[PDB]
């Protein structure tokens, strides 16, 4: 059922893909505001021991809700909090209580407001909360690597996390393509190897097909230390992820 699961994920990621360039239609919020919101969500997920998939799902819900709806400056953090609550309810075994999210928002929004925005986000998404993320495709690709290197997987998670901060240009790539680019970049960074032929057959993504997203991800990785938002770099500094954020990015991708 593994290949069937991957095929279903590929079919469903197009349905769950947010509209590209929705920030232009946003009257108030911009790409930088979304980056700050995603960074704050990374901090929240680290504080509450939330899984990486929870944060990926929260980012996906935020992107879809902003594609289908417009919110002001003050409601962007409420939207992010409601999306994080929904993702925790969907993915986590014990989602944090609504009071915890109200607390972590610095008491900006009351519990009633958080619950109302949760209802609104659920209605807008039409309860389509099982959105494929970069994490799922990355794990699926991990089952297709030999030998399994924990550094490769940790760096691929780090790069997929980095791809969440910048809507430009990672909103124009499907999660499968971003995951493939992250996997190849991690393999080249820590092992000096390329995108595997087994994954070429499984995904249909040749190394040429990932080249645009690969260049974008290499540019993000090189400029990661100088990026305005650094919570992902701090999170992956921990020995749990083998300190992959400490590794220097390769200067050039031999393609």
């Amino acid at each position: 059922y593994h290949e069937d699961i991957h095929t279903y994920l590929r079919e469903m990621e197009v349905k769950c893909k947010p509209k590209v360039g929705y920030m232009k239609k946003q009257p108030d919020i911009t790409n930088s505001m979304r980056a700050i919101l995603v960074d704050w969500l990374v901090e929240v997920g680290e504080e509450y021991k939330l899984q990486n998939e929870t944060l990926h799902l929260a980012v996906n819900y935020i992107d879809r809700f902003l594609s289908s709806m417009s919110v002001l400056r003050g409601k962007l953090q409420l939207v992010g909090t409601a999306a994080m609550l929904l993702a925790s309810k969907f993915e986590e075994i014990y989602p944090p209580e609504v009071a915890e999210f109200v607390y972590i928002t610095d008491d900006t929004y009351t519990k009633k407001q958080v619950l109302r925005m949760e209802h609104l986000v659920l209605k807008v998404l039409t309860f389509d909360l099982a959105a494929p993320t970069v994490n799922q495709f990355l794990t699926q690709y991990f089952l297709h690597q030999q030998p399994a290197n924990c550094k490769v997987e940790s760096l691929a998670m780090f790069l997929g996390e980095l791809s969440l901060i910048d809507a430009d240009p990672y909103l124009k790539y499907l999660p499968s393509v971003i995951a493939g680019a992250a996997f190849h970049l991690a393999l080249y960074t820590v092992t000096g190897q390329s995108w595997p032929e087994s994954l070429i057959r499984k995904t249909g993504y040749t190394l040429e097909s990932l080249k645009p997203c690969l260049m974008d991800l290499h540019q993000t990785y090189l400029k990661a230390p100088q990026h305005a938002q650094q919570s992902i770099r701090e999170k992956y500094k921990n020995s749990k992820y083998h300190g992959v954020s400490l590794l220097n990015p390769p200067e050039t991708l031999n393609l």
Partner: protein, 285 residues
């Protein structure tokens, strides 16, 4: 909500009613959730988000969701009863073997559809298998269902896999296959295969029925959180004793479907190709 008129109560998730559509006229199940506290329950959220992604004949279809500000209404296709009441009614005499085979085939088809997607039922008990009048059994009660695109961390008792009892860290499709095997044995013998009272009594019953698993039978039992050396070394009971009515192929399928090792346990897709299913008809209940 207006187009549905409740006529009776069929269950106590939340209380589920039997509702008639005022416009279409079709009869539907109207499970309701009282939204007070925590917002929409995580169980209901998972049930709606995973059931609407599954469109199979042998899966209770969710054809409408009424999400109001204070209440949440789930509309399922109405089926006559679940496998529990059908088991209870056919207590004097066994359920016909062709009907057992057809029900197992349909349940395995639904499970293979759920597992080809990223859905794990985790609550496969006869109370969760609805039955229609035409002779089709469908999976229901996806409240405990979880999406396993990434590995799912482990959190009734009679249908719990030996791994979940033995401190398993991650769920898998093997737990659903084990629950289906327990349901199959209950269908054949008209009594629960492992009627355990506690997490240790159920494990001891499993060991009594299938023998205490060594490392050769299941590689890794010694290195489990809930495995103790003070486990009696029961022998594996011959499958003719536990399930007399089952034929050789049925007994083989049940043995493969109750394997201790989750990796070596049969899968729904592979179980659908068993020689036990070569003559699957569609008898009415």
């Amino acid at each position: 909500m207006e187009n549905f008129q409740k006529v009776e109560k069929i269950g106590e998730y939340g209380v589920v009613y039997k509702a008639r559509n005022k416009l279409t006229g079709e009869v539907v199940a109207l499970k309701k959730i009282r939204l007070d506290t925590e917002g929409v329950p995580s169980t209901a959220i998972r049930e709606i988000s995973l059931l609407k992604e599954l469109n199979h004949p042998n899966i209770v279809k969710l054809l409408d969701v009424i999400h109001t500000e204070n209440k949440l209404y789930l509309v399922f296709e109405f089926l006559h009863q679940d496998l529990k009441k059908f088991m209870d009614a056919s207590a004097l005499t066994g359920i016909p073997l062709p009907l057992i085979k057809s029900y197992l085939f349909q349940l395995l088809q639904g499970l293979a559809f759920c597992h080809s997607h990223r859905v794990l039922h985790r609550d496969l008990k006869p109370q969760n298998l609805l039955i229609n009048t035409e002779g089709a059994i469908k999976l229901a009660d996806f409240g405990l269902a979880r999406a396993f695109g990434v590995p799912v961390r482990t959190y009734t008792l009679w249908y719990r896999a030996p791994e979940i009892l033995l401190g398993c860290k991650y769920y898998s499709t093997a737990v659903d296959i084990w629950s289906l095997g327990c349901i199959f044995a209950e269908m054949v013998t008209r009594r629960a295969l492992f009627p355990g009272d506690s997490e240790i009594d159920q494990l001891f019953r499993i060991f009594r029925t299938l023998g205490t698993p060594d490392e050769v039978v299941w590689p890794g039992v010694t290195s489990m959180p809930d495995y103790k050396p003070s486990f009696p070394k029961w022998a594996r009971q011959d499958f003719s004793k536990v399930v007399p009515p089952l034929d050789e192929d049925g007994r083989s399928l049940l043995s493969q479907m109750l394997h201790y090792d989750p990796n070596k346990r049969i899968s729904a897709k592979a179980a659908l190709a068993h020689p036990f299913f070569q003559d699957v008809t569609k008898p009415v209940p």
